[PDB]
Design a protein around this ligand. Structure first.
Ligand SMILES: Nc1ncnc2[nH]cnc12
Length: 254
């Protein structure tokens, strides 16, 4: 599979942004124009190139993420354990052993482990054991320095579910979600490279990806919605106000 690398040993805002653009440009179908907007749209599912590999390169090791090109869903991750042995962890309904072998060649079949929980935020959040506030991912914050800290929890260490879950929550939001929502990307670069507080608006965007995509796809003309929409953070009339980075594939426009 194709692989893009984020250098966390020497991070820069420009590098992070280009990294997100590489993801967007890889999965998009440039012939697709939704609601007369210039926002990138994910192309139809491929039977050949199903996965994308993302490498988080740090000073003491590299941790990798596997994403489904069809929808940017995280399907697995790779990290060396305390014995420097490469191990791959995957979500059952998301990928097979043969595909995992092709995605992460450095991991032998015996070292492929199926995760006990679901790939949805709810399942992951419960295993992250967040003890404050609403106990959701919002409570962890966001940021480059936070991502680095989370990677330290899985890189070259014995697997601890709590640490693995927290890493996944941050890794998914800093890649897949940031690719989908420019608002999230802009928050990261505006605060680069510091850890900062997340917002309700961040969560609201995330849970409304499909709704936003459907709205632009079938109820938007030349960037203007046919009616007022509210995804949780106020009324929106123009698609531009949503600062979208990537829209969900819903077919070709009619
Ligand atoms: N595993 C996942 N990857 C990306 N976006 C998601 N939204 C919910 N679960 C997700």
């Amino acid at each position: 599979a194709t692989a893009y690398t984020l250098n966390l040993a020497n991070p820069s805002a420009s590098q992070y942004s280009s990294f997100l653009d590489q993801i967007r440009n890889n999965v998009r179908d440039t012939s697709l124009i939704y609601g007369g907007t210039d926002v990138e749209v994910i192309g139809a599912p491929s039977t050949t190139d199903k996965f994308l590999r993302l490498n988080f390169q740090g000073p003491r090791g590299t941790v990798s993420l596997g994403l489904r090109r069809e929808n940017l869903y995280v399907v697995a991750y790779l990290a060396m354990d305390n014995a420097n042995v490469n191990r791959a962890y995957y979500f059952k309904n998301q990928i097979t052993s043969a595909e995992l072998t092709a995605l992460f060649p450095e991991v032998v079949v015996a070292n492929q482990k199926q995760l006990e929980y679901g790939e949805d935020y709810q399942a992951i959040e419960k295993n992250a054991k967040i003890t404050t506030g609403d106990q959701s991912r919002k409570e962890l914050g966001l940021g480059i320095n936070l991502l680095i800290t989370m990677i330290d929890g899985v890189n070259k260490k014995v697997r601890v579910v709590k640490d693995e879950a927290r890493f996944l929550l941050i890794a998914i939001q800093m890649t897949a979600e940031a690719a989908r929502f420019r608002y999230i990307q802009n928050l990261v670069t505006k605060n680069f490279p510091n850890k900062f507080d997340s917002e309700n608006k961040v969560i609201q965007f995330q849970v409304s990806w499909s709704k936003i995509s459907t709205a632009i796809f079938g109820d938007c003309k030349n960037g203007v919605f046919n009616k007022d929409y509210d995804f949780g953070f106020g009324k929106v009339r123009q698609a531009k106000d949503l600062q979208m980075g990537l829209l969900k594939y819903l077919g070709r426009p009619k």
